[PDB]
Structure formats: C-alpha cells, structure tokens
UniProtKB/Swiss-Prot annotation, chain A:
It is found in: Virion. Belongs to the totivirus major capsid protein family. It comes from the Viruses. Disulfide bonds: none annotated. This is Major capsid protein. Transmembrane segments: none annotated.
Curated annotation (Swiss-Prot), chain B:
The chain holds residues 300 to 349 of 697 of the full protein. It is found in: Virion. It comes from Saccharomyces cerevisiae virus L-BC (ScV-L-BC). This is Major capsid protein. The gene is gag. Signal peptide: none annotated. Belongs to the totivirus major capsid protein family. Capsid protein self-assembles to form an icosahedral capsid with a T=2 symmetry, about 40 nm in diameter, and consisting of 60 capsid proteins asymmetric dimers. The capsid encapsulates the genomic dsRNA and the polymerase and remains intact following cell entry to protect the dsRNA from degradation and to prevent unfavorable antiviral responses in the host cell during all the replication cycle of the virus. Nascent transcripts are transcribed within the structural confines of the virion and are extruded into the cytoplasm. Transmembrane segments: none annotated. It comes from the Viruses.
Amino acid sequence: LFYHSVAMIESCYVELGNVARVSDSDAINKYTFTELSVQGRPVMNRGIIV
Amino acid sequence: SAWFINAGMVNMPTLSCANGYYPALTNVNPYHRLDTWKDTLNHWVAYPDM
Amino acid sequence: AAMFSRNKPLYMTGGSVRTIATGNYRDAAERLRAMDETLRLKPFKITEKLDFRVAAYAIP
C-alpha cells in the first residue's frame, strides 16, 4: 500500500502543477476539467473521482 | 433630448434558485441547447473592458 | 389570448406546458438509462504552443 500511495499522490500533484498554468478563458480549464472526463452518474464530483 | 426626459423601466427578473437544497439535480452531465453556451463568460473573464 | 384582473393585464409565467402522453415516460423506462453505471474517466493529452508559460488541453 506504501508504494501504491506514493504512486497516486505523485501522479496527482504533478498534473495539478501543469493544470494551475492554464487561463480560465478555455474549454478544459481549472474549474471544468472533471465534468468532461467523467462519463458516469456520481452524486457530487469530489473525493476519489477528482 | 425628448427621448431621455421620462425614466425608462429596467425589467429585473425575480431571484429564485433550488440548487443548495437538492444538489443531486446538478451533476457532471449538464443539459444545454447550444454547444457554444460557455463563450460569453470565457470572453468577459479574459477581456472585461471589451 | 388575453386575461384581465383588477383592471390590469394578468400575464402567464413559467415553463411551456406540453401534451403529456403515456408513451413519453415509459420510453425512458424502455431506455431505463441502460448506460452501465461504471465510472469511466477519459484522459486529456496536454499540447504545447509558442508561449509555453500557459497550458492547453486537447480532447484526444
């Protein structure tokens, strides 16, 4: 689980690095990158989905 | 100057919203009629003085 | 069509009323939302251009 944990946080914090450097005036931006990717019916886009 | 004597009426719609009570209705797959439905906000946030 | 009340015009507000049929609901029961309730997350490939300071995501 230790190796699976570092693999997940390293994947997330790397991508949030190059997501923070996009202008709001764009299709896939800071606020609306979760909605277009998700093709299901979750209650709220939070927790494990993001 | 005859146009601007009598005060013209601005029709402001009544403020009502039920997203806070039932957040299940608003999810990741929203309904829109036009595909260019986020252009006006993306234009303003980029160039406010336009 | 026009309606009056208290010697003033009474206007109809809200959504557009439709002719509800028995078929219009049970076609969504026939549909069932048969999209298997499985959270399939699709990726976005980052694309670099002249500035490089700001990032741009593509669909494929």
